[PDB]
Design a protein around this ligand. Structure first.
Ligand code: HC4
Ligand code: MG
Ligand code: MG
Length: 327
């Protein structure tokens, strides 16, 4: 007998790994452990309307109860979150997600006012995907129309010599199939989610212990709806919220990346994965150093301690990466 119904709204199809492997089990756990007093209704593919960038305010303003979105979809809104967009900062989705949740609980209390964070996380390693151009070197990206999540990933694409076109990943299949874009950055599991394997058939990955980029994402509940739940239902949410949920989402993405990458490397799925060796990779890292330098200067101008935020994000990534490897 449902006492409260929580509407969860996001930008991806129901068939996406995070919907199948996280949102469906989350709904099952919340419905079972509340004895039916909490119903969870899942609305994928922007089914309740508006645009992916509107999602954060859809939860905050109580248009819906829970959202899943990219913080970078609102330029300038989450300045401290932006540090997790910087080039070659992240490792796995799981360890980087755990780093982001800890960072947000330490540094982003004002930035996230008005949502109850079920999970502050990242996506798994970002990679390059094109329709025609095989990227074997930095020069190959010159003038390609490419898309990233956020102003700081788009800045890096422009500094690499691409022509970035800002849009949510939910619109990338439209843009690539209609000739608006040549390619997109995203993790491989996002290729699976958006049905892009037979469209972007050219993929480029990097050498070494860091991924090209990631972006901070959030499963956000309206603080007003959480506060409205009875004192015996708030704790059921709490049992399914926090750093463990961030870790789990990343780990789901890492596993879905492995499935997609293995399928292309084996020829089960058409496509080519090009790997750039250490000397070529170093050239992309050198351009990435200019984005980090510029970001720390801009942070200082905005009254943020840029270096301390970057020292904390990088240390938490290395801490949880080391922890994972030790297990
Ligand atoms: O780049 C974006 O706009 C969004 C990226 C994204 C990557 C993996 C997901 O599972 C969901 C969103
Ligand atoms: Mg609210
Ligand atoms: Mg083709």
């Amino acid at each position: 007998e449902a006492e409260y119904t929580l509407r969860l709204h996001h930008f991806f199809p129901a068939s996406a790994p995070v919907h199948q492997e996280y949102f469906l089990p989350w709904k099952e756990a919340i419905e079972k452990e509340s004895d039916g007093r909490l119903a969870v209704e899942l609305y994928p593919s922007m089914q309740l309307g508006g645009t992916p960038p509107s999602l954060y305010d859809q939860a905050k303003d109580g248009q819906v109860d829970i959202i899943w979105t990219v913080l970078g979809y609102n330029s300038g809104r989450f300045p401290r979150a932006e540090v997790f967009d910087l080039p070659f900062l992240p490792t796995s989705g799981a360890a980087t997600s755990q780093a982001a949740h800890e960072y947000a609980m330490t540094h982003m209390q004002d930035e996230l006012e008005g949502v109850y964070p079920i999970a502050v996380h990242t996506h798994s390693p970002g990679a390059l995907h094109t329709k025609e151009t095989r990227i074997e070197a930095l020069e190959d990206i010159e003038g390609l129309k490419m898309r990233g999540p956020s102003r700081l990933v788009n800045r890096y694409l422009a500094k690499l010599g691409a022509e970035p076109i800002g849009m949510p990943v939910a619109q990338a299949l439209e843009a690539l199939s209609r000739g608006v874009l040549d390619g997109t950055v995203i993790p491989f599991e996002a290729i699976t989610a958006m049905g892009l394997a037979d469209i972007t058939t050219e993929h480029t990955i990097f050498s070494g212990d860091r991924a090209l980029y990631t972006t901070m994402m959030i499963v956000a509940m309206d603080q007003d709806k959480y506060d409205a739940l009875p004192e015996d239902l708030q704790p059921i949410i709490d049992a399914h919220a926090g750093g463990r949920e961030a870790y789990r989402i990343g780990q789901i993405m890492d596993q879905a990346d492995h499935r997609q990458i293995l399928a292309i490397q084996s020829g089960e799925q058409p496509g080519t994965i090009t790997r750039l060796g250490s000397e070529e990779t170093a050239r992309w890292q050198a351009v990435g150093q200019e984005v980090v330098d510029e970001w720390i200067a801009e942070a200082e101008e905005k009254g943020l301690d840029g270096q301390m935020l970057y020292d904390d994000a990088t240390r938490l990534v290395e801490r949880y990466t080391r922890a994972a490897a030790l297990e």
